[PDB]
Design an enzyme around this catalytic site. Structure first.
Site, short mmCIF file in Angstrom:
data_model
loop_
_atom_site.label_atom_id
_atom_site.label_comp_id
_atom_site.label_asym_id
_atom_site.label_seq_id
_atom_site.Cartn_x
_atom_site.Cartn_y
_atom_site.Cartn_z
N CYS A 32 0.73 -1.13 0.12
CA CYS A 32 -0.04 0.11 -0.06
C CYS A 32 1.04 1.21 0.10
O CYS A 32 1.86 1.38 0.88
CB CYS A 32 -0.72 0.11 1.34
SG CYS A 32 -1.82 1.49 1.72
N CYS A 36 -1.65 4.67 2.88
CA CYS A 36 -1.26 3.93 4.15
C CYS A 36 -0.14 4.89 4.97
O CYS A 36 -0.41 5.09 6.18
CB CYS A 36 -0.57 2.75 4.13
SG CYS A 36 -1.78 1.39 3.81
#
Ligand SMILES: [Cu+2]
Length: 109
Positions: A32, A36
């Site tokens: 991610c 994130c």
């Protein structure tokens, strides 16, 4: 990251489902990228700020693959709010601190 419970599949039932009160779980993985990365500083602030109101915890889905199936997570970051064993609410993707505070305030009442 000092206040943030690092979860595993083995500890999730104990740390999350058997806990008194609320806990916000951040589902994430190193693959991610920016979304994130963008919420991780904010979670350290929220964990600080909601001390004794809420516990923040992270579960890396690569390293821990059996939890997101039982709750149906499709993408990361997904944030699930638990109150005493139950999912109270879900927020998908990256969001600001102000709108993360709107989500937690509406749901801790
Ligand atoms: Cu910290």
């Amino acid at each position: 990251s000092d206040k943030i419970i690092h979860l595993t599949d083995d500890s999730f039932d104990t740390d999350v489902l058997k806990a008194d009160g609320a806990i916000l779980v951040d589902f994430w993985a190193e693959w991610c990228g920016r979304p994130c990365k963008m919420i991780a500083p904010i979670l350290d602030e929220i964990a600080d700020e909601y001390q004794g109101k809420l516990t923040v915890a992270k579960l890396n889905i690569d390293q821990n693959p059996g939890t997101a199936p039982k709750y149906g997570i499709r993408g990361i970051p997904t944030l699930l709010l638990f109150k005493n064993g139950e999912v109270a609410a879900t927020k998908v993707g990256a969001l600001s601190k102000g709108q993360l505070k709107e989500f937690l305030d509406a749901n801790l009442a």
